[PDB]
Write an enzyme that holds these catalytic residues in place. Structure first.
Site, mmCIF file in Angstrom:
data_model
loop_
_atom_site.group_PDB
_atom_site.id
_atom_site.type_symbol
_atom_site.label_atom_id
_atom_site.label_comp_id
_atom_site.label_asym_id
_atom_site.label_seq_id
_atom_site.Cartn_x
_atom_site.Cartn_y
_atom_site.Cartn_z
ATOM 1 N N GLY A 150 -11.359 4.630 6.848
ATOM 2 C CA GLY A 150 -11.626 3.339 7.179
ATOM 3 C C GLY A 150 -12.316 2.928 9.028
ATOM 4 C CD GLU A 162 -20.424 -5.661 24.595
ATOM 5 O OE1 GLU A 162 -20.764 -5.386 23.157
ATOM 6 O OE2 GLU A 162 -22.264 -5.780 25.262
ATOM 7 C CG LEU A 164 -9.381 -0.751 8.461
ATOM 8 C CD1 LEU A 164 -10.336 -0.963 7.192
ATOM 9 C CD2 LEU A 164 -8.056 0.224 8.681
ATOM 10 C CG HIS A 180 -1.932 -1.158 1.628
ATOM 11 N ND1 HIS A 180 -1.185 -2.509 1.931
ATOM 12 C CD2 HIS A 180 -2.840 -1.419 1.634
ATOM 13 C CE1 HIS A 180 -2.437 -2.874 1.554
ATOM 14 N NE2 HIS A 180 -3.225 -2.604 1.431
ATOM 15 C CG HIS A 203 -29.005 -12.701 26.494
ATOM 16 N ND1 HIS A 203 -30.236 -12.160 25.502
ATOM 17 C CD2 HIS A 203 -28.590 -11.387 27.395
ATOM 18 C CE1 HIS A 203 -30.374 -10.789 25.896
ATOM 19 N NE2 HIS A 203 -29.410 -10.736 27.036
ATOM 20 C CG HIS A 206 -6.223 1.654 -0.631
ATOM 21 N ND1 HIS A 206 -6.538 1.856 0.709
ATOM 22 C CD2 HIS A 206 -6.206 0.256 -1.193
ATOM 23 C CE1 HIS A 206 -6.172 0.744 1.846
ATOM 24 N NE2 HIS A 206 -6.095 -0.514 0.580
ATOM 25 C CG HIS A 256 -3.888 0.161 5.217
ATOM 26 N ND1 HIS A 256 -4.467 0.664 5.842
ATOM 27 C CD2 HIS A 256 -3.654 1.025 4.187
ATOM 28 C CE1 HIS A 256 -5.176 1.720 5.819
ATOM 29 N NE2 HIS A 256 -4.274 2.394 4.373
HETATM 30 C C1 TPP Z 1 -24.850 -6.661 22.682
HETATM 31 C C2 TPP Z 1 -24.929 -6.412 24.517
HETATM 32 N N1 TPP Z 1 -24.767 -6.675 25.547
HETATM 33 C C3 TPP Z 1 -24.816 -6.135 26.556
HETATM 34 C C4 TPP Z 1 -26.089 -6.801 27.272
HETATM 35 C C5 TPP Z 1 -26.280 -6.859 28.403
HETATM 36 N N2 TPP Z 1 -27.867 -6.530 28.796
HETATM 37 C C6 TPP Z 1 -29.587 -5.657 28.871
HETATM 38 S S1 TPP Z 1 -29.463 -4.224 28.515
HETATM 39 C C7 TPP Z 1 -28.779 -4.012 28.395
HETATM 40 C C8 TPP Z 1 -28.525 -2.387 29.558
HETATM 41 C C9 TPP Z 1 -30.088 -1.661 29.331
HETATM 42 O O1 TPP Z 1 -29.100 -0.341 29.074
HETATM 43 P P1 TPP Z 1 -30.055 0.432 28.062
HETATM 44 O O2 TPP Z 1 -31.140 0.292 26.832
HETATM 45 O O3 TPP Z 1 -29.985 2.030 28.724
HETATM 46 O O4 TPP Z 1 -31.454 0.466 29.021
HETATM 47 P P2 TPP Z 1 -32.984 0.298 30.355
HETATM 48 O O5 TPP Z 1 -32.064 0.093 31.036
HETATM 49 O O6 TPP Z 1 -32.880 2.106 29.706
HETATM 50 O O7 TPP Z 1 -33.940 0.204 29.446
HETATM 51 C C10 TPP Z 1 -27.697 -4.140 28.763
HETATM 52 C C11 TPP Z 1 -26.053 -4.088 29.495
HETATM 53 C C12 TPP Z 1 -26.609 -6.809 25.955
HETATM 54 N N3 TPP Z 1 -28.458 -7.589 25.573
HETATM 55 N N4 TPP Z 1 -26.313 -6.876 24.392
HETATM 56 C C1 TPP Z 2 -11.852 -4.279 9.688
HETATM 57 C C2 TPP Z 2 -11.845 -4.526 8.753
HETATM 58 N N1 TPP Z 2 -12.009 -4.747 7.240
HETATM 59 C C3 TPP Z 2 -11.243 -4.108 6.321
HETATM 60 C C4 TPP Z 2 -10.472 -3.868 5.888
HETATM 61 C C5 TPP Z 2 -9.751 -4.473 4.620
HETATM 62 N N2 TPP Z 2 -9.296 -2.686 4.197
HETATM 63 C C6 TPP Z 2 -7.307 -2.237 4.101
HETATM 64 S S1 TPP Z 2 -7.036 -0.999 4.173
HETATM 65 C C7 TPP Z 2 -9.058 -0.791 3.529
HETATM 66 C C8 TPP Z 2 -9.723 0.316 3.371
HETATM 67 C C9 TPP Z 2 -9.063 1.949 3.699
HETATM 68 O O1 TPP Z 2 -9.254 3.138 3.592
HETATM 69 P P1 TPP Z 2 -8.630 4.106 4.623
HETATM 70 O O2 TPP Z 2 -8.278 3.780 5.922
HETATM 71 O O3 TPP Z 2 -9.273 5.224 4.215
HETATM 72 O O4 TPP Z 2 -7.515 4.445 3.904
HETATM 73 P P2 TPP Z 2 -6.168 5.060 2.947
HETATM 74 O O5 TPP Z 2 -6.926 4.431 1.523
HETATM 75 O O6 TPP Z 2 -6.932 5.890 2.411
HETATM 76 O O7 TPP Z 2 -4.975 4.657 3.022
HETATM 77 C C10 TPP Z 2 -9.840 -1.862 3.931
HETATM 78 C C11 TPP Z 2 -11.185 -1.681 3.857
HETATM 79 C C12 TPP Z 2 -9.484 -4.424 7.098
HETATM 80 N N3 TPP Z 2 -7.940 -3.814 6.669
HETATM 81 N N4 TPP Z 2 -9.875 -4.075 8.220
#
Ligand code: TPP
Ligand code: TPP
Ligand code: CA
Ligand code: CA
Lengths: 676, 676
Positions: A155, A414, A115, A26, A477, A260, A65
């Site tokens: 990216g 996460e 990325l 690249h 879950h 690129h 890259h």
């Molecule tokens: C990807 C993911 N990570 C974690 C959880 C665990 N979980 C369920 S509800 C919740 C948080 C609730 O926050 P919010 O969306 O503000 O809900 P509210 O308490 O206001 O109802 C979490 C962390 C999940 N369901 N999905």
């Molecule tokens: C998670 C992830 N998805 C896809 C790719 C494939 N990939 C490498 S570089 C690139 C895109 C480059 O875009 P940018 O970050 O703007 O780079 P520039 O072309 O300006 O150097 C992609 C899609 C990757 N490396 N990682």
């Protein structure tokens, strides 16, 4: 034609020549970012001869890259990487792989290429630096005062993981983080107008970042340096520097997607060289005036480190206890006999969920091991990841914590949590850091988890609610595939402890680790303390829990299913079948034991049945027949789900009896045997 | 004490009573969002007796933990869900699982619960609606004019996947998307001040969304209705409605994290009921005036659908070809004999990479099957996912495409791409949609991929650069664990075609699918056309490529390793060993064949060796010994990497010979046999 201009041309041409020699890689972003790289490295404090100096500024190339650029900088500054290594860019076995790997490349802090990861790693390096400085700095003793510089592209800004980490970094007021966006308006699919038209700067302001814009970053190194100075004055916000560049600057194909990711044409390289005063017949040129200029900066940095070493010696005299702690951490050693704090249980003790056993471990070891910090992704009262009496890591200005705090509120993030943990580990100083979520949602962070394994970072996931045992939340879950996924990834310890002693062994492994990430799969539901478990035996990864010298079958199980196997043994006795039980809390640790030890656990001459309420993938390494769950779960009270799927003493016994019958008259050798 | 107020109280109390009966679940968000749910459903067009009416408005509960709210709405409106089902909330086997599942719950468009997914699904439903309307609507024939309403919470807004989809939705000017943020300032870890202090509204403006703020969403249903009306006037921006609510509104514990996720105390429920005019001794009350009011709206909606059916009949008269196409799609049928467009190859044809074979398939079938749309996550020229002569899906205002376009520029947004694909599938109308990335980065989208499987959506990943065969990009890009992960997930077809005919079979399966997502693992590098392959045989998922009636060993392989196995067969012949070869392009499809068919491919009485340059996990289902790659890859020219790891004809032959020797004197039964 100044020395700075010559250095920038040298960087550009080294990168282009490396890509040309490989006929792969690249050139675009290296050409566009060479001015910024030159300017940033001139502001950075680092020692090419001591890559682990704890008060170095850190650099992260999130747009991995573009690594021909990074490698060129490291070569020019006299890291343990040479022009001969650059000539081997992207060649099998070289020190210059196609994306940077911290295990292989001196001066690569983290492994990038996927990325979005590097910017999050930078957030973690900066988080660690702030926590470290708050822990150790004293009046007249700025033990830690370093910055974290990150390059990223479009990216990285499109990947959601970077949004998560940027929201959190703004919340955390991480003023020693300085990121640089390569604003070149091009990605692989062409103009960013086709998919990426958001107002990035307005978004970063919404996170609480400071912004500096450099409108001619193809040439204006004065403005790039000034942007760094400005960022350093804003101590309560991370800064994003918008570098408006031309991708492939100087190439005939500058400003196009074609530059690129493919080598330049030979005639293009010739005109680059002549335009910049280089010999178009020469490759890998390093003008000695550039080397001289860069060496001056190295020498100054080495004098800074020399003074830091004297500051550290004076710190040890004035603050003997903190100084000894700091020395121990910089030596990579845990406190002597720290593991005497691990809780130990007997079979007379009450049943406890392994999430609660984990809370108890953390509550005992956090006070004993200062380099443990960690958090949860908005699941603190469910994962049970915070020790009572600790303070959260927050900027003191919020009133909600302090940078000396030890508990991180990651929010519902996460993936960024995973990549931030990698950055905390990458900081060094023996940090042993952890992150809690439900096991099923560790999968949201797979991109980062895989990099923990490839990067050899000792991070730990506290992954509770591990199975259908969680009950009513249901199949969205309940993990099925998750342990198989991570066990199939090289270099991941996946602990699924069955009881109190096994949970302590899992933590002993996770905290002692220096090169292997850990996932601790922990239960919602209570499990009994097992007769025959100990930290000593569980530390082997797999062990004989119930030895039966006349076994008709051995049942191998993990976690919540070990107690089930023990109960099945009793049912089987009433059917005239003698069983042994093996507990296999970590397959990776087990695999690393001697062949003789492993055969003592899984011998020849006896059928072996595995039991684990998850995918059966992988289990044939250790068993002849597998009782698992290869369908999605259900929403109901957990005991009813176990009954539905026949994960009951009688259901296990039935399958064990069928296994014995299936091997009647057959010669059975250990699953550990193989043809090659 | 109006009927609207009584309806809101009824919703709140049904949800609370459902949680109480289960002694499990989430009362907080249902209490806070009942006014908004009432207001939104009163604006929506839907038929509880025809959940598939193609011009219905769609509702998505992205904050799926709040599902007691959704179930209450569906019950009150007379969907195929009753109060008796609500009494069985979170009970094994009920129609009211703890998070909504589209397969189980009438009126649940998608499966939510994993945070962030639903809003992205809503983006996909809205994308599909815009594409569908652009394809079919004519003057005086608004065949499609429906809206997509999404509820989401703070957790969804923290998850990076929602940022990706929101950036893209703003770029795409999706004016029929109306999302509602439950701005209650609480998550599981407590106040959002601890982790989520960004200016959400400013961020959404930066994406190009319109904003409406409702500052008293606990009561002000007039303002919520007005916000919907306002959003409908903004036809070129998706709208975010900020609903400032109190979590758990009305509870003694309102406004606290404790009301998020645990049943209310019995005395709390009593005071809720008395305050709102209900009997504190009664549960699951449904005042008949509420039923009457809701039934009036249903009856009006049914008259709207009746008129739509007449519009559709008139459309078929005026536009006979489009009308017949639309009818066929609404019947769930592909064009008659569409598969005659699939390319067919012979062994005399040239070697081709399977990514290029995929491009060729798409170029033949896209013109024949209008319900195919798809895109790539910024890898269009690498994945080869766009057919020449098609236009991109873009708002015409940009000049870059049109909503009638068929190719989506997802940007570097794999996770959102995955969840958007689920939404496109969920729209219906027989959409068969696909998304390209490198196989290793499908892992970034694991959260959504798993939901494709659980939701039974026929989406397709075009997952190129499948192995170490990609070469120089190195181990950060080279899959190891990825196929094992997805094969271990229930209900995922994972095709790894070896050649042109197998690639056509993989697409035949992916496009014909109605309930199973597909991942097509495709090569960077060229592969030969195989002697013995066909669409017919590859459609069985596994088949005998080279039959050897006197086989000493059978080699089972996939993808790029099938040609390797064929070459190894020739080496083995020179060693006096006779081999057969099995090609296993999709393990799931193979598993679904009859037991007799499977045994004809993997018979008893012969050792079987698997060969695939990835994890060996899973392979013991089909083989006695496994030759795989269980370590990370390397950066170099691909043939050199294969040589390093001994994936060569001689290396395979050596392991095959060792396998034959290992089973000398042993009785061997098919790996397909099992004890239970
Ligand atoms: C990807 C993911 N990570 C974690 C959880 C665990 N979980 C369920 S509800 C919740 C948080 C609730 O926050 P919010 O969306 O503000 O809900 P509210 O308490 O206001 O109802 C979490 C962390 C999940 N369901 N999905
Ligand atoms: C998670 C992830 N998805 C896809 C790719 C494939 N990939 C490498 S570089 C690139 C895109 C480059 O875009 P940018 O970050 O703007 O780079 P520039 O072309 O300006 O150097 C992609 C899609 C990757 N490396 N990682
Ligand atoms: Ca770019
Ligand atoms: Ca909330």
């Amino acid at each position: 034609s100044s020395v700075d201009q010559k250095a920038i041309s040298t960087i550009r041409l080294l990168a282009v020549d490396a890509v040309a020699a490989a006929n792969s890689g690249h050139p675009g972003a290296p050409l566009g970012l060479a001015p910024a790289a030159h300017a940033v490295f001139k502001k950075m404090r680092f020692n090419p001869k001591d890559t682990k100096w704890i008060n170095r500024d850190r650099f992260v190339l999130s747009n991995g890259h573009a690594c021909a650029l990074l490698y060129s900088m490291l070569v020019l500054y006299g890291y343990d990487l040479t022009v001969e290594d650059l000539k081997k860019f992207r060649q099998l076995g070289s020190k210059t792989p196609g994306h940077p790997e911290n295990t292989d490349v001196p001066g690569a802090e983290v492994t990038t290429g996927p990325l979005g990861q590097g910017i999050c790693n930078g957030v973690g390096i900066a988080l660690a630096q702030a926590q470290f400085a708050a822990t150790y700095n004293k009046p007249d003793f700025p033990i830690s005062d370093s910055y974290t510089y990150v390059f990223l592209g479009d990216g990285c800004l499109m990947e959601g993981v970077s949004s998560e980490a940027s929201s959190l970094a703004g919340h955390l007021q991480l003023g020693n983080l300085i990121a640089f966006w390569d604003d070149n308006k091009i990605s692989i699919d062409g103009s960013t107008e086709v998919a990426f038209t958001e107002d990035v700067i307005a978004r970063y302001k919404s996170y609480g970042w400071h912004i500096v814009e450099v409108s001619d970053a193809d040439t204006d190194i004065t403005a790039i340096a000034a942007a760094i100075d400005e960022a350093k004055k804003v101590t309560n916000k991370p800064t994003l520097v918008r570098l408006t560049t031309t991708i492939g600057f100087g190439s005939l194909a500058q400003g196009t997607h074609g530059v690129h990711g493919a080598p330049l044409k030979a005639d293009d390289i010739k005109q680059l060289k002549t335009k910049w005063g280089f010999n178009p017949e020469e490759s890998f040129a390093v003008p000695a005036e550039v080397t001289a200029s860069y060496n001056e900066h190295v020498a100054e940095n080495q004098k800074i480190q020399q003074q830091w070493n004297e500051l550290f010696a004076a710190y040890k005299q004035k603050y003997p206890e903190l100084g000894a702690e700091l020395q121990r951490r910089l030596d990579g050693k845990l406190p002597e006999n720290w593991d005497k704090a691990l809780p130990v249980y007997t079979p007379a003790d009450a049943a406890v969920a392994t999430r609660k056993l984990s809370e108890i471990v953390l509550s005992k070891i956090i006070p004993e091991v200062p380099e443990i910090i960690g958090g949860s992704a908005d699941l603190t009262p469910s994962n049970l990841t915070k020790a009572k009496g600790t303070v959260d890591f927050q900027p003191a200005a919020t009133g909600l914590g302090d940078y000396s705090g030890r508990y991180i509120r990651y929010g519902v993030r996460e993936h960024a949590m995973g990549a931030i943990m990698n950055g905390i580990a990458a900081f060094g100083a023996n940090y042993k850091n952890y992150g809690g979520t439900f096991l099923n949602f560790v999968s949201y962070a797979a991109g980062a988890v895989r990099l923990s394994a490839l990067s050899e970072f000792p991070i730990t996931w506290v992954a509770t609610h591990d199975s259908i045992g969680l009950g009513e939340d249901g199949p969205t879950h309940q993990p099925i595939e998750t342990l198989a996924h991570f066990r199939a990834t090289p270099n991941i310890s996946v602990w699924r402890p069955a009881d109190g002693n096994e949970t302590s062994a899992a933590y002993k492994s996770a905290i002692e680790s220096t090169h292997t990430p850990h996932i601790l799969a922990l239960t919602r539901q209570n499990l009994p303390q097992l007769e025959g478990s100990s930290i000593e035996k569980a530390s082997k990864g797999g062990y004989t829990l119930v030895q039966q010298d006349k076994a008709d079958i051995i049942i191998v199980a993990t976690g919540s299913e070990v107690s089930l196997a023990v109960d099945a043994l009793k049912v089987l006795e009433g059917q005239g079948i003698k069983a042994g039980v093996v507990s296999l809390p970590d397959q990776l640790t087990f695999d690393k034991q001697s062949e003789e030890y492993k055969l003592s656990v899984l011998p020849d001459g006896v059928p072996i049945l595995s039991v684990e309420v998850m995918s059966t993938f992988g289990w044939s390494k250790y068993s002849h027949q597998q009782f698992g769950l290869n369908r999605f779960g259900a929403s109901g009270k957990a005991p009813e789900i176990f009954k539905l799927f026949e994960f009951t003493p009688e259901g296990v016994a039935e399958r064990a009896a069928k296994t014995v019958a299936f091997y009647k008259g057959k010669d059975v050798v250990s699953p550990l045997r193989s043809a090659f």
